[PDB]
Amino acid sequence: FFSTSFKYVLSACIASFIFGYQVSVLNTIKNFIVVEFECSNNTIQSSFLLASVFIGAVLGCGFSGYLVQFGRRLSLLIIYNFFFLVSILTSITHHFHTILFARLLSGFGIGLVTVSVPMYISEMTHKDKKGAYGVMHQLFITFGIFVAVMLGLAMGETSFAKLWWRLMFLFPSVISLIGILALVVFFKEETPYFLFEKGRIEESKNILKKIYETDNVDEPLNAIKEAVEQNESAKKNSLSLLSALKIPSYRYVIILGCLLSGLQQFTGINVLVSNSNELYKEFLDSHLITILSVVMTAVNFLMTFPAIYIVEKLGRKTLLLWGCVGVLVAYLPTAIANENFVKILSIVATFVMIISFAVSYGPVLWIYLHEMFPSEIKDSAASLASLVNWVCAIIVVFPSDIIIKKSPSILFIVFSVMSILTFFFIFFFIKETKGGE
Numbered sequence: 001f002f003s004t005s006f007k008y009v010l011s012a013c014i015a016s017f018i019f020g021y022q023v024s025v026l027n028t029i030k031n032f033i034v035v036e037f038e039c040s041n042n043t044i045q046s047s048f049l050l051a052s053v054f055i056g057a058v059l060g061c062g063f064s065g066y067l068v069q070f071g072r073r074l075s076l077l078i079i080y081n082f083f084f085l086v087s088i089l090t091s092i093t094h095h096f097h098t099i100l101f102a103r104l105l106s107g108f109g110i111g112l113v114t115v116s117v118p119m120y121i122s123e124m125t126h127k128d129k130k131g132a133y134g135v136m137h138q139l140f141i142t143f144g145i146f147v148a149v150m151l152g153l154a155m156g157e158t159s160f161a162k163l164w165w166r167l168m169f170l171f172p173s174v175i176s177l178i179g180i181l182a183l184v185v186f187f188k189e190e191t192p193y194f195l196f197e198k199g200r201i202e203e204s205k206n207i208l209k210k211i212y213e214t215d216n217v218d219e220p221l222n223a224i225k226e227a228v229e230q231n232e233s234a235k236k237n238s239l240s241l242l243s244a245l246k247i248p249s250y251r252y253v254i255i256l257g258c259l260l261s262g263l264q265q266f267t268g269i270n271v272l273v274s275n276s277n278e279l280y281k282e283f284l285d286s287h288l289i290t291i292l293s294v295v296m297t298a299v300n301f302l303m304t305f306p307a308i309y310i311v312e313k314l315g316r317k318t319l320l321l322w323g324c325v326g327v328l329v330a331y332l333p334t335a336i337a338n339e340n341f342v343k344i345l346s347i348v349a350t351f352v353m354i355i356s357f358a359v360s361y362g363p364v365l366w367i368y369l370h371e372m373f374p375s376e377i378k379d380s381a382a383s384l385a386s387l388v389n390w391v392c393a394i395i396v397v398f399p400s401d402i403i404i405k406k407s408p409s410i411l412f413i414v415f416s417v418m419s420i421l422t423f424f425f426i427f428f429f430i431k432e433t434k435g436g437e
């Protein structure tokens with residue numbers, strides 16, 4: 001291996017770290033902002049504010065199609081400028097209105113990352129290393145979440161606090177300023193799949209010529225030529241944004257693609273992300289909440305590492321099924337228990353689900369998505385599938401908190417039904433991809 005392939009992956013992964021940090025920055029220092037702003041109406045406003053990121057990420061995943069059409073060059077570059085300017089706005093805080101709009105674009109930006117970065121990795125790494133390098137995207141999403149917790153709880157236990165949580169929202173602007181200037185050493189080249197948009201064939205050759213340092217790249221460029229000629233034809237055919245529902249041959253991929261992306265949220269990951277400091281308040285103290293959460297995100301970040309190597313060994317379908325097994329062992333034993341014995345099962349729920357998610361479904365989705373739909377439909381369908389993920393985030397998180405307050409037994413039971421449904425969905429429909437186009 002030649003680390004120049006990984007070099008371009010890490011440069012795009014700065015945007016994955018800005019996503020993960022934006023997701024949980026406000027979710028940790030939420031209580032601090034309440035002090036200035038105004039429980040009660042704050043609980044309602046805070047839920048509205050949480051939604052703006054999910055509603056914005058839907059619109060981000062939507063736009064990162066019209067945007068990616070101009071290249072993953074501008075697509076990534078633009079996020080770093082945007083996120084630097086959103087971080088400047090989020091940091092200037094006064095009232096809910098300002099921070100709702102600011103955290104709506106922190107969601108629009110986040111959306112772009114979910115489509116743009118996995119596509120960049122998928123479109124520059126070798127067929128055989130595609131999965132592990134795509135796993136990097138999640139490895140920095142998870143790292144972004146944990147960093148936010150360690151940075152925030154650093155102030156935990158004020159005048160030198162009001163000038164700190166402000167400095168926390170501003171942190172991703174410096175990271176974006178790093179990433180933007182870092183894509184001056186890297187972003188003088190765009191992924192070889194740009195052969196279809198621009199006939200810069202010699203430039204396309206010189207991309208793979210540096211990636212693996214092989215001067216004769218007749219193998220992947222003639223493989224890209226066959227994938228580009230399939231696109232060149234479809235444009236003359238005029239295959240619409242849809243045509244998936246119109247053509248049964250294309251419906252089986254768009255529907256299964258959207259279904260798998262949506263089923264990621266029907267696991268209960270973002271219930272533990274957005275309500276880390278809230279869901280544990282039911283019994284556990286404020287001193288305990290901060291510990292069980294800082295350990296959780298550290299575990300979540302650490303568990304993404306084993307996925308790097310086992311995504312090419314087992315594959316994508318083999319890993320997906322194992323994640324659905326571990327989630328049944330995390331949900332069903334806790335579901336019947338609540339119809340010292342259940343206090344132990346609380347820690348089992350805390351980590352068994354986190355452990356099985358970060359190594360299995362978490363990264364696999366964002367890499368399996370850019371491995372499906374081998375033709376022009378690729379970028380197109382990969383944007384709408386990732387949008388369903390952010391649509392489902394609203395569909396899962398919102399009712400989950402309502403149902404946790406009324407009956408937790410029914411909640412863990414419905415999540416175990418989905419844990420059975422997803423396993424048998426992957427086993428019956430989901431393909432296995434280890435190298436293609």
Ligand SMILES: OC[C@H]1O[C@H](O)[C@H](O)[C@@H](O)[C@@H]1O
Nearest residue numbers: 138141142269270273300362
């Ligand atoms: O690690 C947690 C994260 O995993 C994935 O990236 C999901 O898409 C995201 O919604 C979740 O917050």
